[PDB]
Scaffold this active site. Structure first.
Site, PDB file in Angstrom:
ATOM      1  N   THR J  26       0.797  -1.244   0.000  1.00  0.00           N
ATOM      2  CA  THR J  26       0.000   0.000   0.000  1.00  0.00           C
ATOM      3  C   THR J  26       0.819   1.280   0.000  1.00  0.00           C
ATOM      4  O   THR J  26       1.926   1.213   0.485  1.00  0.00           O
ATOM      5  CB  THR J  26      -0.797   0.061   1.298  1.00  0.00           C
ATOM      6  OG1 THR J  26      -1.302   1.389   1.408  1.00  0.00           O
ATOM      7  CG2 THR J  26       0.045  -0.294   2.500  1.00  0.00           C
ATOM      8  N   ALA J  74       1.507  -8.641  -1.932  1.00  0.00           N
ATOM      9  CA  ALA J  74       2.932  -8.670  -1.638  1.00  0.00           C
ATOM     10  C   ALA J  74       3.635  -9.832  -2.318  1.00  0.00           C
ATOM     11  O   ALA J  74       4.715  -9.652  -2.893  1.00  0.00           O
ATOM     12  CB  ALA J  74       3.155  -8.727  -0.133  1.00  0.00           C
TER      13      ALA J  74
END
EC number: 3.4.25.1
Lengths: 239, 96, 213, 196, 263, 200, 113, 228, 245, 224
Positions: J26, J74
């Site tokens: 993020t 991720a």
């Protein structure tokens, strides 16, 4: 232990069908390529004029991309196949690694294709040698030479086909700084080199040149015939 | 390694007799360099695959072992895809 | 109509000191509202210097721990050395990602010594994003364990306190106490506590008791 | 979405596209050249869903260039349009086509200017003018109003300016700049960006 | 120029590919659209009996696209072999192509063998094909014929199942046709009696059904004779037209006209 | 979706094939010159009706096969055979149907006998003696032709009848129209006319 | 990670186009397995080995892949010389309708690429 | 030398293996085909000489469809394979186009199949040459298929052993004016010119093809014909 | 080193299998093509001189490949049939892609690629067929093309392949109004060429297969010459050589 | 034997809650002023509402010529830039010249274009100093590959767009650009809930990236 069945090493190791495709380019039309400072030249003789032949279809100076142009010698059909494959490779590389391909990369691809037809009892080797020449994105002239075996040594001034060492060993003593400083000066070098083995005059001596960032431009017997214009350029200013 | 340039018109840098398999492996060729070009490609690809899978630098012995694994597939033409059908023609010197 | 997955529960925890790397886990195997067994440890010994602990779906735990052992043996055969901790972690990330579209529902934490003998702990996710941490907890009770570890090991949110290096004895005390606390509130944790102490002298195991309910 | 427009006159083709490349409530870039140069005289306006537009346009561009270099001459605009249609139609099967709305604009030394409209189903249709995106609804009437088969270049460009101004007036999305190129007997000509 | 892309189209036989276009072109369904044509249901009342020494098949000749009578003389008694015929109900194209391929297979068989093909062979070919195709080829057939081993009558359902009966009926008007048979059928009828019975049975499926109704076809297959009575009866005729619409010359306006002399 | 409508009509050694000219995406007229009648011979046309993306594909899938047929056998194709290979081409994609319903109309090259037909999207030969229709306006053409048609009509009356059928059927359908094209095939000559239709 | 061939991927496709996609496309191999299991179970391993052993050397030399082929001897080795199906009439390989460069298609047959 | 491969052109450039299949055909059993103005007759010579052999089982003038029949001269099994695939080809064409296959197209397809064995390596060319009769919209057709894959259209020809003299016999015995009833008789004469065994009832097999389609003559009809 | 396997280079560079393939061409019927300013003709010697033959239909060596361009063959006629079928299929494929008739070089090169692929990876007999191509395209107008079993090719203004090829080409070189000849002047030239390359037998319309191509009214016309035109051309050349005395 | 797990089941050449998970990424950022590119990102990675980690290095260290960026998922990112780094190194080995940023972005885009709509959640952002100058591309999971002067992606991308746009200028001297990136990421993590931790800062100068600083938002809050 013989010429036979490519995948065999001679008791010395001279696996022979490659040794013969190596010698298969001794009957093709002589090709010459000299790399200058700002121009790359590519000259091929055509001593099969065959007057009632459309000079356009037999043309040997093929183009591989906007920045790469190609000559060859030997079996014309194999040359057409490898040229088609090289063009598709150039476009595919520009599709995935988008940039104009380096002359190095396409030379390596052609060499790898040639080599890949040397294992696998299978296929027969390509019977041609290529003179890959062109300008690269960083702006430098290049000149390369492939063989049926797969070696792709890069040169500064070359010759393949009939009269190989004749042209090359003439050209040993003529490549100099005062032969690439100016363009038409570079041109006259290749013309004289080919005239050493020419069929006595500019008989379809298919010359094509390439300056930076513009195109392949096959010099053609214009209204001026720069071909002849330069033939008696040298043949006037020889004395 | 000697280079044995044939003619002055040949670019010395073109003759490729010592390559970089990776930052810590050097290789020397001798023989049919047409074969050396595929062996070196195998070595480089293996070193990078090992680094990718295993966050480490591939030891020299394992590199040469993998390159040997590319060899010894002399004749198994029953296995159709892309075999050599012949031994390679190059002797290699992996230093690292 | 067929749930290819089921949650068997189980909690793991790792601490990386200077000379050690604690890996501890409860030994209760659960399913829905039943206890399959009370003596199923969730820490496996990989190498003399590296210990893995898996938690989550037990079937994938078994399959993954066997694949990992096989891969260590293949590495030992090809490369002629036992894998380092970092190499094992990178391999595990790759293995986990190979099933990106059918994930290994397991949470893995690697605890052991790196090349220089200092402790190191690697924390994973069901598809293999690993990273180095000084401590971690995963599984059902991870949410109960991690804040307390942040407070006591990382000294988060405390002021004017001496940052003593974490000793092995204090590490054992801390792990035992945090699992005593966790067994109280989490239903999936209890019935025993297998603790693996990975030091330079090998791997020694201590096991204590929790609430049996 | 985005916006394409094409106008075909006596002996030229005028095309214009927005420069906005949005990803969400935010726009990520405002110089998006949505216009792919197939050849020296062919332009391929490609729009649609993210990712597929660029890939399909790159595929077709590489094929037109490959044909040109393999043969020496160049694909005629009708040939390029039909080949693109064949390529897009066949992909309405496996690789879920690509929802690429196309607008092929080109000139031939022999056949005159040509403009081809293509929806995401590969339904080819020659037209004197067309448009894609939600903006097409607002501009097509204005195109119908002041368009004649015989339009000088300046009249065409001011007509395009009229369309874009009204699109600015009504269309809810923010499209501040539009890249404009004209195609005539001498290659492709860039024109000054229409900005607000 | 034989472009390098797909390795090749080395295997034809029933695409899929090009099916996800079908799946996501709801159009007809949601997004208005809905031109999106659908297929057919031809074969709506077909019947067969086994009289004393042969088979009598029957079928109406109405083919309905949706709820509009598309064809008014659609033949539904297909030719399988010089002694075997087969009525066809269910999806139209599937029945057509299936019967044609089975006819080809069967008369290749009879050609290489050198004797008249048996009905049971055609029954097996049809059964195994339809079962192979898992029933997505909806093709309900009534197989009839006479071999050396006496008359035979089969009823092949789309999913592969076949039933051998002295009388069968299929189609949208199958039930209405079955009423006549169950009430009037006797074993060992003569030719004229069986023809009358089948005519009534199809007539039941014509007046008493919506998916059916037109001229009536019959196929009387005996041990030695094969009468393909077509059309056997014309129960319904176009109502005579009262007006004289009769479009006159010059009534329509023409913008552009192009003329091309051919010969 | 795209829309479309075609018909055929038989007569006294003359047939008539017609089509609308709307190419639109689901509401939005885009062009008024979409081709739906393709020349497959001297006196043999095919009319497609359905998805524009499949009108353009089937008409080229079929020109390929037709040219190969003609070259291999060296004779102009009979209309019935052309009908029979459209069934094959369509039934090939039985589970992947080409969303189109062709109509074939023409004359026998050696007999000049009128021939018409119609096929559904999976291919079911339907040879009729009076007329065939296809497309979105399915009911309207049926209703018009069942009333105006007559047997043994000379070509000009044939043109009147088919023109009226088009003009009055497409006018009652929203997604078809924008002009009408009509071809009258005769034993000697082909007439192609564009009729005056409402452009709304 | 390449293209100039239709980006050979189809990863989005994966799931069949229909329960009748893979099965109907490869019913030739499906029937081969049906008959081999019929013969392994009852006749022996020698009969499937014979069928594999022959079918190998009926395909090795018919024609190069970039040209159409009839494959005669294969057909009368399986019952297909008098049984003709939907794979014979629909999109015959004679009019394959899609071809690539000859060489590039004759190499993969053996498997150079 | 060079007569071993089927894939090795001679230094004289002539394919010796196909050169040999022609000799196999020329060493076969004679066959004659004649195009009459309204039909075609095929007659062939039967080697089933011993009385134990049967006629109810194996036939040489063997049909393809309602209007095409073959006859060969060469190796019988190779015939049988060829006729099986000719039937395949005819039915394939009939499914694709609802039309009886034209004779010329069937000949071309069968010839392509036959050639496909001439250039493959590791196989052998068919040891048979086919004579094909047909009837398509009101004109008779007669074709001969060479083992190399070449095909020819003959008004009348003879094949099998002693064919060159049968070819010459048909020369000053054939013309436009002959028609089917006389064509039968002249074909019979052509056969017995080199029959070597003075035929009876079923020493031969005869087929005809008029618009009633291809039909094999029953032995009684041949017996009727041998009466004159 | 020797004549085998079609994939061996002799120890002297020469592909002996292909050299033998270009030997069967030296036995087939003479076939020549001439390029004129306003059209192209493609004459051929029909060596099926036997009288019992029928079906003079349009061709025995003059095939038509698409709407624009036609072909002629020489050599093993079965392989010629295979090649002509492949040409027709390739032309239709290109038309399917780009919706334009294929340029002649496109198709010639597409075929030569296959013919070369048989003189390479293989183990199969190379196609012993040498072709001639006549056609039109908007890119260069009238074109004539030759091919060998080797896969080589070339555009020729006037050529000849088959029996007596050398004498025909020599006469054509010495005899050609290069660049400024009309159609049936080239027809007279072609008749002269065939009269040069006779057997003992004097030629007649029963031994010739002239075909012509023409650019008219936007449509390309390939009409094979019928009986009467050919016999009239023959009388014309006959008188011309008669008064040439 | 049924299936009998053969051996290492399937793992060969992987290179091209119930299990459903892969953490998160993020609030990343990069712009391209005159002295090169600088890349900024936070260090937080959440799992539902629960932070799995506060020290997630989101700026992938592809090679000492070129940087990447993690966002959206991720593991998907980490794996795909790792393979991209492998490919870049192989290319540099073969052709003996560093690969240009344009080429690497296209490599990654083509690699991720396959698997379209199969579940990838990549949000990468390639950065580097190639032969042509600064390089900056936004390669994401659905196939976008766009250059540009300024970018920012992640859950808190919009806040960064705000502050960065009002702070950006192509003639911005280095130390001010550092502060601009710090401020932008700090504001983004101030408003957004999914962004937090330490603000990593990379500078892609001439040959070789460098690491500027890694300040914690807790200390930055006091700093501002």
């Amino acid at each position: 232990s013989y010429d036979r069945a490519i995948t065999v090493f001679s008791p010395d190791g001279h696996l022979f069908q490659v040794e013969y495709a190596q010698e298969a380019v001794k009957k093709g039309s002589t090709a010459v390529g000299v790399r200058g400072r700002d121009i790359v030249v590519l000259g091929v003789e055509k001593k099969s004029v065959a007057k009632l032949q459309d000079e356009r279809t037999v043309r040997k100076i093929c183009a591989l991309d906007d920045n790469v142009c190609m000559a060859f010698a030997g079996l014309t059909a194999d040359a057409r196949i490898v040229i088609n494959r090289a063009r598709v490779e150039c476009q595919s590389h520009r599709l995935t690694v988008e940039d104009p391909v380096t002359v190095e990369y396409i030379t390596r691809y052609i060499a790898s294709l040639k080599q890949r037809y040397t294992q696998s009892n299978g296929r027969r080797p390509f019977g041609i040698s290529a003179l890959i020449v062109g300008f690269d994105f960083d702006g430098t002239p290049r000149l390369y030479q492939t063989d049926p075996s797969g070696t792709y040594h890069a040169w500064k001034a070359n010759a393949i086909g009939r009269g190989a060492k004749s042209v090359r060993e003439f050209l040993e003593k003529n490549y100099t700084d005062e032969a690439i400083e100016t363009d038409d000066l570079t041109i006259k070098l290749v013309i004289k080199a080919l005239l050493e083995v020419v069929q006595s005059g500019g008989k379809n001596i298919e010359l094509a040149v390439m300056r930076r960032d513009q195109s392949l431009k096959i010099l053609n017997p214009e209204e001026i015939e720069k071909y002849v214009a330069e033939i008696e350029k040298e043949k006037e200013e020889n004395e | 390694v000697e280079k044995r340039i044939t003619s002055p018109l040949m670019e010395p840098s073109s003759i490729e007799k010592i390559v970089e398999i990776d930052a810590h492996i050097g290789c020397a060729m001798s023989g049919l360099i047409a074969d050396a070009k595929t062996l070196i490609d195998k070595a480089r690809v293996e070193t990078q695959n090992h680094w990718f899978t295993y966050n480490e630098t591939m030891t020299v012995e394992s590199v040469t072992q993998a390159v040997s694994n590319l060899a010894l597939q002399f004749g198994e033409e029953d296995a159709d895809p892309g075999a050599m059908s012949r031994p390679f023609g190059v002797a290699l010197l992996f230093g690292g | 109509r067929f749930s290819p997955y089921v949650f068997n529960g189980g909690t793991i925890l790792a601490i990386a000191g200077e000379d050690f790397a604690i890996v501890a886990s409860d030994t209760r195997l659960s399913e829905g509202f039943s206890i399959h067994t009370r003596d199923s440890p969730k820490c496996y010994k990989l190498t003399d210097k590296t210990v893995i602990g898996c938690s989550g779906f037990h079937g994938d735990c078994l399959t993954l721990t066997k694949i990992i052992e096989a891969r260590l043996k293949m590495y030992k055969h090809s490369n002629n050395k036992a894998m380092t901790t970092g190499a094992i972690a990178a391999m595990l990330s790759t293995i986990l990602y190979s099933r990106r579209f059918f994930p290994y529902y397991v949470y893995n934490i690697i605890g052991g010594l790196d090349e220089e003998g200092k402790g190191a702990v690697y924390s994973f996710d069901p598809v293999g994003s690993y990273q180095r941490d000084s401590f971690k907890a995963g599984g059902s009770a991870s949410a109960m364990l991690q804040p307390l570890l942040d407070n006591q090991v990382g000294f988060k949110n405390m002021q004017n306190v001496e940052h003593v290096p974490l000793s092995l004895d204090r590490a054992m005390r801390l792990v035992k106490d945090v699992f005593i606390s966790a067994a109280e509130r989490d239903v999936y944790t209890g019935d025993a506590l297998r603790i693996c102490i990975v030091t330079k002298e090998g791997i020694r195991e201590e096991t204590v008791s929790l609430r049996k309910d | 979405m985005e916006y394409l427009i094409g106008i075909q006159g006596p002996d030229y083709v005028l095309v214009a596209s927005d420069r906005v490349a949005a990803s969400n409530i935010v726009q990520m870039k405002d110089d998006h050249d949505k216009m792919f140069k197939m050849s020296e005289k062919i332009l391929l306006l490609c729009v649609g869903e993210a990712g597929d537009t660029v890939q399909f346009a790159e595929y077709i561009q590489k094929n037109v260039q490959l044909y040109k270099m393999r043969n020496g001459y160049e694909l005629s605009p009708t040939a390029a349009a039909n080949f693109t249609r064949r390529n897009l139609a066949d992909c309405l099967r496996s690789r879920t086509p690509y929802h690429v709305n196309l607008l092929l604009a080109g000139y031939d030394e022999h056949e005159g200017p040509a403009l081809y409209y293509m929806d995401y189903l590969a339904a080819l249709a020659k037209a004197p003018f067309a448009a894609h995106g939600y903006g097409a609804f607002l501009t097509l009437s204005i195109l119908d109003r002041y368009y004649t088969p015989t339009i000088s270049r300046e009249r065409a460009v001011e007509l395009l300016r009229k369309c874009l101004e009204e699109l600015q007036k009504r269309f809810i999305l923010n499209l501040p700049t539009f890249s404009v190129r004209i195609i005539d007997k001498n290659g492709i000509h860039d024109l000054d960006n229409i900005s607000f | 120029m034989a472009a390098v892309s797909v390795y090749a189209p080395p295997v034809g036989g029933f695409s899929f590919d090009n099916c996800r276009r079908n799946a996501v072109l709801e159009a007809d369904f949601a997004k208005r659209g809905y031109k999106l044509p659908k297929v057919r249901k031809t074969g709506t009342t077909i019947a067969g009996v086994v009289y004393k020494d042969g088979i009598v098949l029957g079928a109406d000749t109405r083919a309905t696209e949706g709820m509009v009578v598309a064809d008014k003389n659609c033949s539904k008694i297909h030719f399988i072999s010089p002694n075997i015929y087969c009525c066809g109900a269910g999806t139209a194209a599937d029945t057509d192509m299936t019967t044609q391929l089975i006819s080809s297979n069967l008369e290749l068989h009879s050609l290489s063998t050198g004797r008249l093909p048996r009905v049971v062979t055609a029954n097996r070919m049809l059964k195994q094909m339809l079962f192979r195709y898992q029933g997505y080829i909806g093709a309900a057939l009534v197989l009839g014929g006479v071999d050396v081993t006496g008359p035979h009558l089969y009823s092949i359902y789309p999913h592969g199942s076949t039933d051998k009966l002295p009388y069968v009926t299929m189609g949208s008007g199958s039930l209405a046709a079955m009423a006549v048979f169950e009430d009037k059928f006797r074993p060992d009828m003569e030719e004229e009696e069986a023809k009358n019975l089948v005519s009534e049975a199809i007539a039941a499926g014509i007046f008493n059904d919506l998916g059916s109704g037109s001229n009536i076809d019959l196929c009387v297959i005996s041990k030695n004779k094969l009468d393909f009575l077509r059309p056997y009866t014309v129960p319904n005729k176009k109502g005579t037209r009262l007006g004289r619409y009769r479009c006159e010359k010059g009534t329509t306006a023409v913008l552009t006209e192009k003329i091309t002399p051919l010969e | 979706y795209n829309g479309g409508a075609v018909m055929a009509m038989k007569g006294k050694n003359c047939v008539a094939i017609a089509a609308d000219r709307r190419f639109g995406i689901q509401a939005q007229m885009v062009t008024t010159d979409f081709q739906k009648i393709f020349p497959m011979g001297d006196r043999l046309y095919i009319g497609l009706a359905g998805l524009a993306t499949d009108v353009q594909t089937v008409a080229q899938r079929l020109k390929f096969r037709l040219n190969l047929y003609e070259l291999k056998e060296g004779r102009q194709i009979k209309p019935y055979t052309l009908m029979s290979m459209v069934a094959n081409l369509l039934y090939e994609k039985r589970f992947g149907p080409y969303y189109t319903e062709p109509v074939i109309a023409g004359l026998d090259p050696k007999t000049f006998k009128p021939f018409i037909c119609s096929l559904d999207l999976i291919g079911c030969p339907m040879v009729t003696d009076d007329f065939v229709v296809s497309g979105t306006c399915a009911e309207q053409m049926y209703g018009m032709c069942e009333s105006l048609w007559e047997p043994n009509m000379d070509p000009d009356h044939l043109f009147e009848t088919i023109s009226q059928a088009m003009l009055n059927a497409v006018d009652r359908d929203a997604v078809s129209g924008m002009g009408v094209i009509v071809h009258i095939i005769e034993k000697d000559k082909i007439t192609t006319r564009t009729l005056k239709a409402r452009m709304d | 990670d390449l293209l100039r061939k239709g980006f050979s991927c189809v990863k989005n496709e994966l799931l069949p186009s229909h329960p009748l996609e893979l099965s109907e496309k490869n019913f030739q191999l499906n029937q081969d397995k049906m008959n081999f299991s019929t013969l392994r179970n009852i006749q022996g391993l020698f009969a499937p080995l014979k069928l594999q052993m022959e079918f190998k050397a009926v395909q090795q030399v018919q024609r190069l892949p970039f040209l159409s082929s009839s494959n005669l001897s294969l057909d009368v080795l399986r019952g297909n010389d008098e049984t003709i199906g939907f794979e014979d009439i629909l999109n015959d390989p004679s009019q394959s309708e899609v071809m690539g460069e000859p060489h590039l298609m004759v190499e993969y047959k053996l498997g150079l690429l | 030398g060079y007569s071993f491969s089927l894939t090795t052109f001679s230094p004289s450039g002539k394919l010796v293996q196909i050169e040999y299949a022609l000799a196999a055909v020329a060493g076969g059993a004679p066959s004659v085909g004649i195009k009459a103005a309204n039909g075609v007759v095929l007659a062939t010579e039967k080697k089933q000489k011993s009385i134990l052999y049967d006629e109810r089982s194996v036939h040489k003038v063997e049909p393809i469809t309602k209007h095409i029949g073959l006859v060969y001269s060469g190796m019988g099994p190779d015939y049988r394979v060829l006729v099986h695939r000719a039937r395949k080809l005819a039915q394939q064409y009939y499914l694709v186009y609802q039309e009886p296959i034209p004779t010329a197209q069937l000949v071309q397809r069968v010839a392509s199949v036959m050639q496909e064995y001439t250039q493959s390596g590791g196989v052998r060319p068919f040891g048979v040459s086919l004579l094909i009769c047909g009837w398509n919209e009101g004109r008779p057709y007669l074709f001969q298929s060479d083992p190399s894959g070449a095909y020819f259209a003959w008004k009348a020809t003879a094949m099998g052993k002693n064919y060159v003299n049968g070819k010459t016999f048909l020369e000053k015995r054939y013309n436009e004016d002959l028609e089917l009833e006389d064509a039968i008789h002249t074909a019979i004469l052509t056969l017995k010119e080199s029959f070597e065994g003075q035929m009876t009832e079923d020493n031969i097999e005869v087929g005809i093809c008029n618009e009633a389609g291809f039909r094999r003559l029953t032995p009684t009809e041949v017996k009727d014909y041998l009466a004159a | 080193r020797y004549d085998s396997r079609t994939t061996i280079f002799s120890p002297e560079g020469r592909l002996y299998q292909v050299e033998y393939a270009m030997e069967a061409i030296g036995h087939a019927g003479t076939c020549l093509g001439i390029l004129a300013n306003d059209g192209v003709l493609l004459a051929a010697e029909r060596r099926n001189i036997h009288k019992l033959l029928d079906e003079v239909f349009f061709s025995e060596k003059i095939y038509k490949l698409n709407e624009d361009m036609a072909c002629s063959v020489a050599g093993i006629t079965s392989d010629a049939n295979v090649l002509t079928n492949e040409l027709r299929l390739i032309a239709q494929r290109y038309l399917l892609q780009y919706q334009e008739p294929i340029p002649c070089e496109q198709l010639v090169t597409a075929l030569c690629d296959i013919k070369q692929a048989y003189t390479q990876f293989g183990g199969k007999r190379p196609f012993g067929v040498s072709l001639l191509y006549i056609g039109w395209d908007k890119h260069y107008g009238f074109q004539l093309y030759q091919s060998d079993p080797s896969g080589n090719y070339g555009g020729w203004k006037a050529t000849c392949i088959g029996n007596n090829s050398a004498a025909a080409v020599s006469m054509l070189k010495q005899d050609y109004k290069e660049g400024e000849m009309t159609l049936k002047s080239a027809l007279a030239l072609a008749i002269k060429v065939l009269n040069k390359t006779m057997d003992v037998s004097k030629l007649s319309a029963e031994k010739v297969e002239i075909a012509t191509l023409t650019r008219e009214n936007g449509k390309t016309v390939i009409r094979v010459l019928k009986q009467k035109e050919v016999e009239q051309l023959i009388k014309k050349h006959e008188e011309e050589e008669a008064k040439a005395e | 034997l049924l299936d009998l797990g053969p051996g290492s089941l399937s793992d060969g050449l992987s290179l091209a809650e119930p299990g459903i998970e892969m953490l998160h990424g993020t609030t990343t950022l990069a712009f391209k002023f005159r002295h090169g590119v600088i890349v900024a990102a936070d260090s937080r990675a959440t799992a539902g509402a629960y932070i799995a980690s506060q020290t997630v290095k989101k700026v992938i260290e592809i090679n000492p010529y070129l940087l990447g960026t993690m966002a959206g998922g991720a593991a998907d990112c980490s794996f795909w830039e790792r393979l991209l780094a492998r490919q870049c190194r192989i290319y540099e080995l073969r052709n003996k010249e560093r690969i240009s940023v344009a080429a690497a972005s296209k490599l990654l885009a083509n690699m991720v274009y396959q698997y379209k709509g199969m579940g990838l959640s990549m949000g990468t952002m390639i950065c580097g100093w190639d032969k042509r100058g600064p390089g900056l591309y936004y390669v994401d999971s659905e196939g976008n590959r766009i250059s540009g002067a300024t970018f920012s992606v992640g859950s808190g991308s919009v806040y960064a767009y705000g502050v960065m746009d009002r702070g950006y200028s192509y003639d911005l001297e280095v130390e001010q650009a550092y502060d601009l990136a710090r401020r932008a990421i700090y504001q983004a993590t101030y408003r957004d809930a999914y962004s937090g931790g330490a603000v990593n800062l990379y500078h892609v100068r001439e040959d070789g990236w460098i690491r500027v600083s890694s300040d914690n938002v807790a200390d930055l809050h006091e700093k501002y």
